[PDB]
Design a protein around this nucleic acid. Structure first.
Lengths: 117, 64, 143, 201, 14
RNA sequence: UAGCGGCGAGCGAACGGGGAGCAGCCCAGAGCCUGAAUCAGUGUGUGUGUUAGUGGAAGCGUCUGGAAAGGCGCGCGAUACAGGGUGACAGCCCCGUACACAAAAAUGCACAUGCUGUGAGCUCGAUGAGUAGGGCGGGACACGUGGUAUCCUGUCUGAAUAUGGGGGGACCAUCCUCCAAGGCUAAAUACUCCUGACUGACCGAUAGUGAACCAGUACCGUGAGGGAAAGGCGAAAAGAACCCCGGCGAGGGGAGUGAAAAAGAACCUGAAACCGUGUACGUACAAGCAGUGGGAGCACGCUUAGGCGUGUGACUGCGUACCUUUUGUAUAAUGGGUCAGCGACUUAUAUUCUGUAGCAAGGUUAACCGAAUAGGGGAGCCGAAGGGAAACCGAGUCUUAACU
């Protein structure tokens, strides 16, 4: 029984072109380039989830370091100082506080300096 | 069609009990008065095929 | 029941389908490697050929001849000695019970095991111990 | 075994090992696959690259033309010339052992018995060659789709069911393992059971 | 095209 | 398998066994009897089939629907539910089919029965010579000249004649068996340009014939030869009366037919690449496989009244395509202009292994018969015993004078 394959290549080629929607040039139009676009856009979305944690991590560390040097201490003194007082607050929330509330952050600099110095 | 035996292999290998094959030793046809007598007695019994060259024989003669 | 029938588990196996994609495994060259003679269409050498070296069946010397008599003889057990017709056994009447075959002109008897009836074997050539088993069960073998 | 009828209400003693025995599924599947696969006549044929009505002259030069190398117009990658592995007329008819056929009929007789589908009656025939009689008659026993299988076939009964759809009236020589499953009920003469007991054995 | 001409000869190099 | 074989590659029987089908004669010869068998070929008639054909059962009302054969309700025909068409899917609308008959003629057949024409049965003979065989050179035998019998032979010779001859695989002897040098003979057997019907786990317009369409045509070639592409309005042409722009155009907009004219002949469905128009957003100080993670702003819809949904995406981190080949590719190594359709581990028969199913020391049939995927058919194959080159022996056996 002879098998024609027109109606299934619609589904494969269109399944690729729906994901490739939004791409410049032939990468949204031509299937033979859009498959090659979708794969490479799968690798980048796989690697950049790994890089997302580090790229926010240095954002947080930059926020804490900037506000901490406003309040009269470096970042490294502040983090050994937070470790000495046995304070389990991460860099995420601690970078979050320094933007919104300077004052609880300021007391948190004081608790860094108390056990630290 | 059914397989044809390598006929020159059927005249040199002969099936044994447990499925192996026996054969002659290949140094006893000519140039003999120089060979030591121990060397020629140890070729006179029939001997079995090694397993390195047993797949070749299972392939080449497919019936016996 | 004609849409509820089904085969047992592992009866069908559905085959290596070569050259279908990446994820099949055996696709793109399908199981046969990269370049060379075994990777070609109809490639791979014949039987017994050792790549140019003098093959195994030609290094070795041919022995023996092929006896003509060894075709026309048979090797009778003791199992089918009762199957014949009652109690008397010759070359023919073994041939009608179909244990020896039509071309066959000679016959011995082997102590394979367990004859039961009183048997009269004639014209056959019973060895040593099946002699003791036909005599020991009560039969007698005349020449 | 106790084949009790429903009209004469009488016992019928058959072999337990022939009739009231086990149901091996994957054997019955094998005989129905081999039977339906025996039904194929399989008269297909396409044509390879040696039967397409064409030539053998190379379409162009081997070298120097910009186009890909090609050697014949009958090649299976070209349009209108092709079929690299063309199929031929073949025999799909596959062999069963005799004991698996007879045994699997014994197994489906067992399954028809334990489901209260197989019906034994005594001598069961029609009076005039008219399908009108078989309509009322198989209305009365509540038999929508049957296998009226008898041991003595005649012109009276067989003609009166040649135009009924869901009725197939066979000779007791000719039962086959796709019918004994492919009917909803089966009704048998006591003589037909008398013969199937012998034949299946 | 039915007639495909012979390609313009290569620069020697021999 | 036995063998044959640079004993390599490979080639490959027979004997004997089962089956389909069976059928025997005539001349080399005169006498006797003599139309004694049956055919060859005419004549008529009996059937039997083809070449035209005939009859051929049985249903309505409502519901949507362009239209019903569809829906539910309710009746019947069926030795007719094989098919096809009918405004959508019909046993009961039409053609049919089941079945039942039918031929003036021309016939095919079986034979009945005449009839031209040819010749049985006995008794006695006769019993195929430049042939068999041989040397030389080749060929067919499974057999390649080998220790090579058998047959056909180009060349040169050359028997005996039933007290004789040929074969029985070099050859001889004994046995067995058959009688050439002249012939004829059905059936099983193979094949399908063509004819009829039927069937398909075959194709459905890049498939299947090369050809569904006035295709072996256009067209190409001096010629041989090559050799395409090309289906579909709708149920019905009802295929557009008429009016207007326009060149008594092409094309178009109204009307009109139609269920639908985004079914209008460039005609069912109408995908993609490609080419536009309209909206939203981004872009004219900004460098790079063009994406991705973060994210402003804007434009729409949401429902809570603060964040969703969607589109674009300023700015920023990172980020040198895919395949093949390779030790190694961003590679300035190969390949692809893009889309769409086709395009490559198949099939037959043997052997070996694994799963599984049946049976089990047994398992199993091939051809063929078959009211037939049944059942017969055990011809046969593989196993249950091996050792040896082999006779031969046998749970042993071989080597050897024997084996510690």
């Amino acid at each position: 029984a002879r098998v024609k394959r027109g109606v299934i290549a619609r589904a494969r080629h269109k399944k690729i072109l729906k994901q490739a929607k939004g791409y410049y040039g032939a990468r949204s139009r031509v299937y033979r380039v859009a498959f090659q676009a979708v794969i490479k856009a799968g690798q980048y979305a796989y690697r950049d989830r790994r890089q997302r944690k580090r790229q926010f991590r240095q954002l947080w560390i930059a926020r804490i370091n900037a506000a901490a040097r406003q309040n009269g201490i470096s970042y490294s003194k502040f983090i050994n100082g937070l470790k000495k007082a046995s304070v389990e607050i991460d860099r995420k929330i601690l970078a979050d506080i320094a933007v919104f509330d300077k004052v609880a952050f300021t007391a948190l600099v004081e608790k860094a300096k108390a056990a630290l110095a | 069609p059914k397989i044809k035996t390598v006929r020159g292999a059927a005249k040199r290998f002969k099936k044994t009990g447990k499925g192996g094959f026996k054969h002659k030793h290949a140094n006893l046809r000519h140039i003999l008065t120089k060979k030591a007598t121990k060397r020629k007695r140890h070729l006179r019994p029939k001997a079995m095929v090694s397993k390195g060259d047993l797949g070749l024989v299972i392939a080449c003669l497919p019936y016996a | 029941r004609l849409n509820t029938l089904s085969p047992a588990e592992g009866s069908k196996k559905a085959g290596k389908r070569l050259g279908r994609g990446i994820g099949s495994g055996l696709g793109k060259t399908g199981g046969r490697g990269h370049k060379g003679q075994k990777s070609r269409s109809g490639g791979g050498v014949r039987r017994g050929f050792e790549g140019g070296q003098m093959p195994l069946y030609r290094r070795l010397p041919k022995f023996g001849f092929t006896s003509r008599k060894a075709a026309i003889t048979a090797e009778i057990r003791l199992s089918d000695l009762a199957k014949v017709e009652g109690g008397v056994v010759d070359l023919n009447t073994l041939k009608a019970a179909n244990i020896i075959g039509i071309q066959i002109e000679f016959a011995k008897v082997i102590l394979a095991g367990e004859v039961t009836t009183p048997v009269t074997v004639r014209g056959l050539r019973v060895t040593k111990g099946a002699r003791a088993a036909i005599e020991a069960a009560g039969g007698k073998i005349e020449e | 075994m106790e084949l009790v009828l429903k009209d004469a209400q009488s016992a019928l003693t058959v072999s337990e090992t022939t009739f009231g025995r086990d149901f091996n599924e994957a054997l019955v599947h094998q005989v129905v696959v081999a039977y339906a696969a025996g039904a194929r006549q399989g008269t297909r044929a396409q044509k390879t690259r040696a039967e397409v009505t064409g030539s053998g002259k190379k379409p162009w030069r081997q070298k120097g033309t910009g186009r890909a190398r090609s050697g014949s117009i009958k090649s299976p990658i070209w349009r209108s010339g092709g079929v690299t592995f063309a199929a031929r007329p073949q025999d799909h008819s596959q062999k069963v052992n005799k004991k698996m056929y007879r045994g699997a009929l014994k197994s489906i007789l067992s399954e028809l018995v334990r489901q209260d589908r197989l019906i034994v009656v005594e001598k069961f025939s029609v009076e005039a060659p008219k399908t009108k009689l078989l309509a009322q008659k198989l209305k009365d026993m509540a038999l929508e789709d049957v296998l009226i299988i008898t041991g003595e076939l005649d012109e009276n009964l067989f003609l009166a069911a040649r135009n009924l759809h869901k009725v197939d009236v066979r000779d007791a020589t000719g039962i086959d393992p796709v019918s004994l499953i492919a009917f909803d009920k089966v009704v048998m003469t006591a003589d037909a059971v008398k013969q199937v007991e012998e034949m299946l054995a | 095209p039915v007639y495909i001409p012979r390609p313009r000869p290569p620069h020697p190099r021999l």
